Amino acid sequence: HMDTTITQNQTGYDNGYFYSFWTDAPGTVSMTLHSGGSYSTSWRNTGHFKAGKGWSTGGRRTVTYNASFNPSGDAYLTLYGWTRNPLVSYLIVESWGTYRPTGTYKGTVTTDGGTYDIYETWRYNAPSIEGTRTFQIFWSVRQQKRTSGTITIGNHFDAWARAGMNLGSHDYQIMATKGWQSSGSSTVSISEG
Numbered sequence: 001h002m003d004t005t006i007t008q009n010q011t012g013y014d015n016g017y018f019y020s021f022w023t024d025a026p027g028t029v030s031m032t033l034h035s036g037g038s039y040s041t042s043w044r045n046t047g048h049f050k051a052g053k054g055w056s057t058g059g060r061r062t063v064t065y066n067a068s069f070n071p072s073g074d075a076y077l078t079l080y081g082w083t084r085n086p087l088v089s090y091l092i093v094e095s096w097g098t099y100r101p102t103g104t105y106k107g108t109v110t111t112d113g114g115t116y117d118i119y120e121t122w123r124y125n126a127p128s129i130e131g132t133r134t135f136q137i138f139w140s141v142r143q144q145k146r147t148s149g150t151i152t153i154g155n156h157f158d159a160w161a162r163a164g165m166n167l168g169s170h171d172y173q174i175m176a177t178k179g180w181q182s183s184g185s186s187t188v189s190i191s192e193g
Helices: 153-162
Strands: 004-006 010-014 017-023 029-033 038-043 048-055 062-071 074-084 088-096 104-111 114-126 133-142 148-152 169-180 184-192
Touching: 017 029, 017 169, 029 048, 038 048, 048 074, 048 184, 062 074, 062 088, 062 169, 074 184, 088 148, 088 153, 104 153, 114 153, 133 153, 148 153, 169 184
Parallel strands: 088 133
Antiparallel strands: 004 029, 010 017, 017 048, 029 038, 038 184, 048 169, 062 148, 062 184, 074 088, 074 169, 104 114, 114 133
8 A cells, every 4th residue: 555666676567557677776766656657766876777667568659748857967758668689779868967868860750749869879788678788779869858748659660760770579668767877856657549
């Protein structure tokens, strides 16, 4: 009869929603899982972390979200997901803190009232859904920040494909808070369509 609080690397289900939690700085960050599609995070002088709720069946859905996003430094509010064969992680970054991600620029996609820059990067020997690996990351980064709205994910997937950024078969997909060597808090509420 209390909200579950996650502090150790794991995935699972809470109140019908898939969740994922990962950090390399255990004890510096927590995720509290609320009723429905809502969660909060709190972090203090963390290392790296990524945490959120969403779906173990990733794919071309529409995600509507509303968030309080309060980073004191480097953090993102981002849809975050994975595919296998090829192993790819992807991020649709809605807001950021002191640092806006960048990478190999592929063009833009205009969707959901915003224009997003498309980037691809490689991440070297890093944690993944298939162990510690090098893998590509596909990015859409909103040209300006927002903390609520709708993400029409298929429009991003289609733009990435046109840019030669090829996804594999879907694994999970979450509306995440991500942090790097910062402090802060977030609360995020989601729904699918």
